[PDB]
Amino acid sequence: DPMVSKGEELFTGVVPILVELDGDVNGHKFSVSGEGEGDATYGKLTLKFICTTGKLPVPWPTLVTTFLMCFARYPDHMKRHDFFKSAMPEGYVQERTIFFKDDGNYKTRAEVKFEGDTLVNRIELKGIDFKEDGNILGHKLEYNYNSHNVYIMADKQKNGIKVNFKIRHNIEDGSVQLADHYQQNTPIGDGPVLLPDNHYLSYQSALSKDPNEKRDHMVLLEFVTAAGIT
């Protein structure tokens, strides 16, 4: 399939990644930069993020889903369903509204595309209605992350896809904070894209720190694999 071979071709080796994010949550403005690489053949990503404006006003775990589905590993028999890579190199826009249960919500807009040989993810984030002593602004989330499934379905009306899933953030008291994610992806180019049948992506994530880094940061490792179609 010429289309599959196209995107595939762009992600055959290790691809350098650049991440830039500008956010504002409850009047607190901040910026974050991230770098790393992705290897779609194995569905692996490795990134290091640094808050360049000082201390991050929100917990790092809350930004994991915001900070690259195009690096997912799609089994051979599911390659014709890989919307993410078919939209490259022009890219796609990834929009979300993340609802934190009993708390505020994030509104994000990201552009994911190639700039030379580098995959860039430019993000704008707006957080509103957060409680001053809730789990987010109160920094009560643990520095860890659970495994989750992301459900994908076509949105032929917009020549793109709709995505939905719930994240469970562990709270320091043993309880959990739910984050409902509503997502929409549309291509940037006018070119054709692959619209998939219903399926999902399994995500495994591990968070760490760089013992040598004095700046507020986060090291993220992700494993992503497509599934749901026999």
Tell me briefly what this model is.
The chain is mainly β and 230 residues long. It has two helices and eleven strands.
Round the Cα radius of gyration to an integer and report it: 17 Å
Fraction in beta strands: over 45%
User: In order across it, which strands form the biggest sheet?
Assistant: 1-2-3-11-10-7-8-9-4-5-6
Number of domains: 1
Class from helix and strand fractions: mainly beta
The termini sit apart by: 19 Å
CATH topology: Green Fluorescent Protein
What is the global morphology?
globular
What is the CATH class name? Mainly Beta
**Proper CATH architecture:** Beta Barrel
Number of strands: 11
Helix count from the secondary structure assignment: 2
SSE order, as H and E?
Answer: HEEEHEEEEEEEE
Largest sheet: 11 strands, mixed, barrel
Fourth-level CATH superfamily: Green fluorescent protein
PDB class: luminescent protein
Keywords: beta barrel, chromophore, luminescent protein
Assembly: monomeric
Entry title: crystal structure of citrine, an improved yellow variant of green fluorescent protein
